[PDB]
Amino acid sequence: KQFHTGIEIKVWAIACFAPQRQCTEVHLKSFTEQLRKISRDAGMPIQGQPCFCKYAQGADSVEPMFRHLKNTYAGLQLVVVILPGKTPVYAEVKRVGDTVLGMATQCVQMKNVQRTTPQTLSNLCLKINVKLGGV
């Protein structure tokens, strides 16, 4: 797909389902900073400060967390979900986001948060661009 202009992601959250001892606060902050810069450079700026950034454990935590987000943050545009490898969490994020609450979500693997690359960040940006683009 082609790149869609006019996207500005002001209200967004991080839900980290990877263990904090593996994906620490500094990893999260660093990843967020890198994402802020590349999305900005591309003309789909994601603001540096998420409205919410918390750890959770297990697929069962997905629905309560997303409901909380929907109920707390008006105009929420995106939830970025960090996954610990291959996990039932992924299917649950898709079920809850797409079919239950109608919330835009984008998953990213823990390994790409611990150590980012421009390529993996670009992959993430393009996926988000498709989701929020209106075509």
Swiss-Prot record:
Mod. after translation: Hydroxylated. 4-hydroxylation appears to enhance protein stability but is not required for miRNA-binding or endonuclease activity. Ubiquitinated on surface-exposed lysines by a SCF-like E3 ubiquitin-protein ligase complex containing ZSWIM8 during target-directed microRNA degradation (TDMD), a process that mediates degradation of microRNAs (miRNAs). Ubiquitination by the SCF-like E3 ubiquitin-protein ligase complex containing ZSWIM8 leads to its subsequent degradation, thereby exposing miRNAs for degradation. ZSWIM8 recognizes and binds AGO2 when it is engaged with a TDMD target.
Effect of residue 94 to A: Impairs RNA cleavage
Resulting phenotype, residue 66 to V: No effect on miRNA-binding or target mRNA cleavage. Abrogates binding to the 7-methylguanosine cap of mRNA and prevents inhibition of translation and abolishes interaction with TNRC6C
Variant or mutagenesis effect after changing residue 106 to A: Impairs RNA cleavage
Origin superkingdom: Eukaryota
Renumbered residue ranges of the record's region Interaction with guide RNA: 85-127
Compartments reported by the entry: Cytoplasm, P-body; Nucleus
Subunit structure: Interacts with DICER1 through its Piwi domain and with TARBP2 during assembly of the RNA-induced silencing complex (RISC). Together, DICER1, AGO2 and TARBP2 constitute the trimeric RISC loading complex (RLC), or micro-RNA (miRNA) loading complex (miRLC). Within the RLC/miRLC, DICER1 and TARBP2 are required to process precursor miRNAs (pre-miRNAs) to mature miRNAs and then load them onto AGO2. AGO2 bound to the mature miRNA constitutes the minimal RISC and may subsequently dissociate from DICER1 and TARBP2. Note however that the term RISC has also been used to describe the trimeric RLC/miRLC. (Microbial infection) Interacts with Epstein-Barr virus (EBV) tegument protein BGLF2; this interaction participates in the regulation of cellular miRNA by the virus, leading to enhanced SUMOylation.
Domain notes: The Piwi domain may perform RNA cleavage by a mechanism similar to that of RNase H. However, while RNase H utilizes a triad of Asp-Asp-Glu (DDE) for metal ion coordination, this protein appears to utilize a triad of Asp-Asp-His (DDH).
Function: Required for RNA-mediated gene silencing (RNAi) by the RNA-induced silencing complex (RISC). The 'minimal RISC' appears to include AGO2 bound to a short guide RNA such as a microRNA (miRNA) or short interfering RNA (siRNA). These guide RNAs direct RISC to complementary mRNAs that are targets for RISC-mediated gene silencing. The precise mechanism of gene silencing depends on the degree of complementarity between the miRNA or siRNA and its target. Binding of RISC to a perfectly complementary mRNA generally results in silencing due to endonucleolytic cleavage of the mRNA specifically by AGO2.
Disease: Lessel-Kreienkamp syndrome: An autosomal dominant disorder characterized by global developmental delay, intellectual disability of variable degree, and speech and language delay apparent from infancy or early childhood. Behavioral disorders are observed in most patients. Additional variable features include seizures, hypotonia, gait abnormalities, visual and cardiac defects, and non-specific facial dysmorphism.
Record family assignment: Belongs to the argonaute family. Ago subfamily.
Annotated protein name in UniProt: Protein argonaute-2
Provenance organism: Homo sapiens (Human)
Gene of this entry: AGO2
Residues of the full protein shown: 440 to 574 of 859
